[PDB]
Design a binder for this molecule. Structure first.
Ligand code: HEM
Ligand SMILES: [C-]#N
Length: 142
C-alpha cells in the first residue's frame, strides 16, 4: 500500500514545496479554505473573525503555514518508521480532536494537499498513499 517509489516522490516533492512554502503555504491554505468552508471555520479564532478573502497575507497565515509544514516535514522524513509516524499522529490527532475537528476534515486537507503537490513534481497517487497510511493511524484517535 505504500511503495518505495511513492515514498521517494513524496519526500522529493515535499522538499520542493518546502523550499517555496513562504509563498506556497498561504496558497495551499486558500485552496483548502475555498474547497472546504467548514475547515476555514475552525480557523476563525486564529484569524479573529476575518472573512476568508482577507486572510492570505496575514501574519497569522504565515505562522499557520509554518506550523503545518513542520509536521508534514516530520512525517515525510520518517516514512519507513511506523512507530515514529504513530507517535506524531497521536499528538496531532489529540490536538485537532480537542478542537472539534473530524477525521473527515483532516482527510479533506490531505486530499487538497495531494492535488496541490502536483505543482512540485508530486505524484498525486503517492501523496494519496501516504495520506492513507497516516489516516489509518489518525482515525482510531479521532
Ligand atoms: C493534515 C493536516 C494538518 C496538519 C499537518 C496540521 C498541522 C497542524 C500543527 C502542527 C498545528 C500546531 C500544533 C497544534 O496546536 O496542534 C496545527 C494547529 C491548528 N490546526 Fe492543524 N493541521 C492539519 C489539519 C487541520 C484541519 C483540517 C483543521 C481544521 C478543520 C486544522 C485546524 C487547526 C487549528 C485551528 C490550529 C490552531 C491554530 C491556532 O493557533 O489558533 N488543522 N495544525
Ligand atoms: C493546521 N494547519
Amino acid at each position: 500500500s505504500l511503495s518505495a517509489a511513492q515514498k521517494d516522490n513524496v519526500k522529493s516533492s515535499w522538499a520542493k514545496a518546502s523550499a517555496a512554502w513562504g509563498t506556497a503555504g498561504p496558497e495551499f491554505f486558500m485552496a483548502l479554505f475555498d474547497a472546504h468552508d467548514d475547515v476555514f471555520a475552525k480557523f476563525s479564532g486564529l484569524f479573529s473573525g476575518a472573512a476568508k478573502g482577507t486572510v492570505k497575507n496575514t501574519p497569522e497565515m504565515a505562522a499557520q503555514a509554518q506550523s503545518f509544514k513542520g509536521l508534514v516535514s516530520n512525517w515525510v522524513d520518517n516514512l519507513d518508521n511506523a512507530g515514529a509516524l504513530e507517535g506524531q499522529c497521536k499528538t496531532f490527532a489529540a490536538n485537532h480532536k480537542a478542537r472539534g475537528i473530524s477525521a473527515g476534515q483532516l482527510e479533506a486537507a490531505f486530499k487538497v494537499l495531494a492535488g496541490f503537490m502536483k505543482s512540485y513534481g508530486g505524484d498525486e497517487g503517492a501523496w494519496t498513499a501516504v495520506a492513507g497510511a497516516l489516516m489509518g493511524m489518525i482515525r482510531p484517535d479521532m
